[model samples]
Target: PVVEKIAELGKYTVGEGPHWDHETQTLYFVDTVEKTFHKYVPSQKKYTFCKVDKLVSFIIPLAGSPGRFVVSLEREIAILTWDGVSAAPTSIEAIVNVEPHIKNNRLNDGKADPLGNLWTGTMAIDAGLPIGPVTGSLYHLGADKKVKMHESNIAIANGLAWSNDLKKMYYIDSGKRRVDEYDYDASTLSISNQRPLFTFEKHEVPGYPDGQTIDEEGNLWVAVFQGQRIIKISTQQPEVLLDTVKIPDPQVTSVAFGGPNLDELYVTSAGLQLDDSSFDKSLVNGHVYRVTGLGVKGFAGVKVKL
Candidate 1:
């Protein structure tokens, strides 16, 4: 595949949660530590962002609500209104708060299910450390505006994707160093029968799984943080690795399928680990990337119902 850096977008401190909005033909992502939200219009070659007061983890456009999105600010889930050009949002209304009692935890990666329910997770505020405590949890914010805790005791809750058929949900807790699968019930927006689909050994992969996206064929493309690559894994019985996309940056944070044909894969990375003296600063880090010629198309992301 042809991998190219998207120099049009700003270099993020810790870029994560890339979402492809097929309806508008736009790509949305966030710079967590920089506390900024980004939008890239590939056709127009336009880049815009809005700064917030707290850490902004992810951004998902709302269904039937153009220019409106569901965003996570620190530990709260809020709705943001923007015209895509303004430096500031028109308004940010808090919908619900997660892990309010856990002062050391903050919201992490998030995505909307096929039926429009928001599924987000949280991790320790110091999750970037070499060893982070497992105090995080996964949540489900239903269309009815109700919140439910699905899983707890997670270390670094990250990466979320659903199968094309909506029968399976793939999740990653970076602390666990493995990808777990659960039986998903779309009608009820619940998951059960959890099982480990694959585990990455440090001697082999060298990084925790950060974020993931599913293709039309039910294969998962996972970004390997600190590993400098993304692996495409088959979700069938006896799961297998099908492909690998090498990235220049060490902290490959997330991945999304974009472009007019949905065959282009957009990857995000981090550049905030300046404290690590051994970290490579020569390669282009923290910039979003576009990988083409993959010969695979992905399903467009779903928007939150409300």
Candidate 2:
């Protein structure tokens, strides 16, 4: 594939969650380490951002509200609408505090289902430390505006996406070195019958799978962290490797399909933990990439009902 560095948003600490908003015709993402939210207009060649006080994992657009977003912070989920025509978001309304019993956990990768419910998972703040333990769980913020825990004992909750048919859902536990699929209910936005879709072999790939999305054909595309690549896998049995997109950066965090026709692939990378001395002084670490001529279209991300 022909990959291009379309946007040099900035020098981010840990850039992630590159979500394409069909309503706004722009790409929105976050710098997790710096606790900042950003939006980029490709045509306008414009970049805008807002810095928050807490680490932000992901941001999803609300279905009924224009220019409004549901943002996931460390311990709380809140609603942040537009502040001004050209200014970053400021006024935030509280939604729910996640994991009140656990003080060391924070929200991670998340996406909305076809049913318009927000599904996100949590991981430990001290995940990089040697003293780490299993301190994460998968959660779904339902239509009733209630937080429900679906699965437990996750190490690092990363990639999340539902099948195009809405009958199956795929999730990745980055620490587990595997991707799992579940029987899904589109109406209720629930999942069951968990089974492994693919087990990642460490030496076979350079890095672990961090974030993922499903194409219109139900194929899974996952961004490999520290691996410097994105792999496409078949959804059902036989789990074949159909293709791969080699990224310029090792910390390729997430992937989203967007563009005028949703045929372009947008990738987010992180500069955190990279040896600055070893990297070229001219090249920035966290640049957003655009992949074209893949011959595949993506399923548009759904808006959260709440």
Candidate 3:
């Protein structure tokens, strides 16, 4: 395994996305179960937390700007801006309100494409209905307020990333335990050539690929819940097994490249399944973690106006 032991950064509950802000040198993330989002700066030894009205699974700091971000809310996308860290979000601009959404749906993982498009997924939460007779979908919203829906009937659409050179798009259907590859047309923002990169199996144990990232070498690294670790897979000749850095809990939700040099892996996990008594035992649940392995930088999520 090319990846090895890294520090156990922190714990999280329903932690989903880990967004690294370079201008301020802090890690931002979401708490699906907590209805909160947080920004943590290691250099200043500071942690800034924000309370949101709904469950947020994705975050994108405005490009070439500070104190602004686009967040996903159930069936809607909103832009939140604050003057400073301690200040609360003052202005909220709504781009789209998906009120006609499928009643069982809630927004899931999301990211912005290099071209400033916001792409995300939706999940079915109504247990009254079968889990996925028609589950979630991949949605793309452009700055022009145009909305497009891609693949559907998806159980859970999560991880998303692009190759460093931006030739292809990578996405994962979490409920399927498979990563799909795609060809991209940047100018028009079209993607085709969809195929699978890898699928999580029993060998992956109770863990499954939840969120994913790619290194400079084009190797895809994934975090598996219940698996207690991260896995790197290569889809090339002389394929490489990067490393699997282990964690203790079951829900390792997301990972990203951050730190001054962009070599650090910032992670997020959950404590949802833990019994009330077990929750207190694992302080790390509902927190974030930082692990160093493959040196990689991450692409920023762009502001999707729609």
Candidate 4:
């Protein structure tokens, strides 16, 4: 709970999915509503930010592999590769494109299985408008770039994370105020035994589950978007509360681990609800925050070998 704001980066519109590439020591995240991708390398004291016209819901460097990434667009999962910092998207091809029932649904948050397939979530966007009743799905992107839609009819699909051993997967169905769990087969990327692992207290109402990560001891760290805080929970069904990092802003979208030991908890937030009044409330949206004593380093990113 020793939370400290990173005075380094600025704000974003709707920031999310803060993933750290340990080997490279770079942090990659998305601006859900802005259609942009941001990369921050604190070591180099610089950042590489790009705009992807399509809604970039989730992204990750191809694990230990170089020049490759997996992203979710509206109803399609794509493979993008790059050579270096100056590299543009060499290939932006979607593996699935014909899910007419879920149009405007983009991939949200995702993580890779131990074998290198990307497990992600998708959300509905009405051509960039806040369409009511979020309709998104869960998808698995194999190393071959083949996409398999898992489930659908969800309201705001969010975090997709796994435990270190890869025996289990933790997911957030954001709107339902629930964190779900599934029995995972790391090698096959198949999941079963789905059930609610955690649910925010109704008193924490009006806010919802946004993004999250798993600690070394098997606890899930969740970013409480719209609540201005993050919550840590152990998987004991009754759930043991671990910690909470609070911020002044209301839209702390997601959280991740970075720094040398992967102990630094990097947070993602947004400057949403732009209006005459709420504008000043979100003084720092679309930016990242960092805190220490996270005591956990997430499992490494597996190669998105597509």
Candidate 5:
């Protein structure tokens, strides 16, 4: 594959959550530590960003609602209105707060399922620390604006994806260092029969799984934090490693399919936690990357129905 840096978007402290909006032909991503949201127009080679007051984890456009998005502000999930050209949002209305009683936990990676329900997870704010506690949880927010806790006792909740058939849901708790699959019932928005599909320790995969996305053929692509690579895994029983794409940076954070054809893979990385040597003097650690010639297409970013 052809790996190229998106120099125009600049660099980030913790670049993550790459989402391609097919409707607008734009790519959206975020910098968690920097508290900023970014948009890239590939056709026009344009880049725009918006700064927020709190740590911003992920941004998902609302279904049928243009210029509006569902964004995470640390522990609070809110709807933000922006004209797509401003330095800040026009309005930020809090919809619901997750883990309100847990003062130190913050929302992390999130995405909308094929059914349009929002699935987001939370982790201890200091999860980067080795001493961080397993106080995080995964949540499901329905179109009715109701929140449900699906799992708890998670140390660093991150990465989420679903099968194209909608029969399975895959999740990652970086602390667990494995990808778990659950039997999903989209009709009722429930999950059951949880089991491990890919374990980093058992497979000897380096680093932890940070963020994930699925391809047109139902294969899983995962960014390996501190692993310096993104891996592709098959969804069959007793999953097998299909391929691995090496990245120059050691802190690859997330991945998404972009471009008009949805065949280009856009990967995000982190510069905040790298050592002096791995960080690189040339500043290649935190820039977003584009990978092409993969010969695989991916589903466009899903919008939250709520």
Candidate 6:
């Protein structure tokens, strides 16, 4: 399918987390290095950003709430009061700190499960190329206002999504160049029957899987950084590669199916770590993109209870 540059946000350092707010018919994302959260109004073609005090990793709409979003801060989650399409958030109410005890870690990719609980992961402080040791872990914050660690020993926990049927979950650890799947128990917020869905060969350097989204047909879309492309893989048979959407920029970070009907696929990219010799600015850098006619629809992001 053809890929198009949807919006250029003016050199975002690490533009990731493209989430669709169904009720508002808008897109939300963040720039990790820039310490900002952004929202885009497709109808008006307007974009606005709010600067956060610390690094912001991801943002998702809360399930039971309206005009409010759950944000992943440096090591905590907060309730963001979305002002409007043209203004920044008015305030941020602090939620649970996922890893207050671990000063060396920060929150990364996260989203709400079908059951209304939030599922997010953390990574090491120096989680970059030639990644450090596996000290990161995944956590689940329930509706009862309690948080629990689900998976540990992760170096750079990134993309995460549950199958449309709520029977399986897909995850990424960019350092491993692979995505893992587990049988999901939404009721208990647990996973089992783990296995590798697929892996890129050594030649696919720089691009390990960074963020992921699943379509209604149970296909997984992966934004591969350094790889400059999005890979579509079949969930029934993880090794089966279905299709690919090419990206112009190298640091393609994450993807989400958005648009009014959830048929539009939105991709997020990063501009950090680019030097004169390596960085290419002729194209849209640190921008967001949308792909259409993919013949698939994504389930709307689930809202977390808390």
Comparing 1 with 4 on lDDT, the higher-scoring candidate is 1
Clashing pairs in 2: 207-227
* Residue 188 alpha-carbon offset, candidate 5, angstroms: 1.4
Candidate 6 structure quality by residue, lDDT tens digits, 71-112: 987998899887755346778898888888989889988887
Tell me the whole-model lDDT of each prediction, alpha carbons only: 0.87, 0.82, 0.70, 0.71, 0.89, 0.81
Which portions of model 5 show Cα errors greater than 4 Å?
Answer: 129-131, 274-284
- TM-score of each model, paired residue for residue: 0.96, 0.93, 0.85, 0.86, 0.96, 0.92
Name every residue pair that clashes in candidate 6: 63-303
lDDT of 5 at 45: 90
Error of 1 at 306 (Å): 2.0
List candidate 2 segments past 4 Å from native.
84-88, 129-131, 274-284
Q: How good is model 2 by TM-score? A: 0.93
Tell how far residue 194 is off in model 3, in angstroms. 1.9
lDDT of 5 by residue, 19-89 (tens): 99998899999999999999999899999999998998999998999899999999999999998879999
Which regions of candidate 1 deviate over 4 angstroms?
274-278
Q: lDDT per residue, candidate 3, 79-136, as tens digits?
A: 8786546535778787786435576577888887766678888877541111344477
In model 4, what is the error at residue 306, expressed in angstroms?
3.3
Report how far off residue 262 is in candidate 3 (Å).
0.5
lDDT of model 4 at position 234 = 82
Compared with the true structure, model 6 gives a TM-score of 0.92
Residue 59 in model 5: shift from native, Å?
A: 0.4
Estimate, for each residue in 18-123, the C-alpha lDDT of model 1 and write its tens digit: 9999988999989999898988999999898998899889999988899899999999999999998898999999998886788978999999988888999998
Error of 4 at 16 (Å): 1.4
Query: Which candidate model has the greater TM-score, 1 or 4?
Result: 1
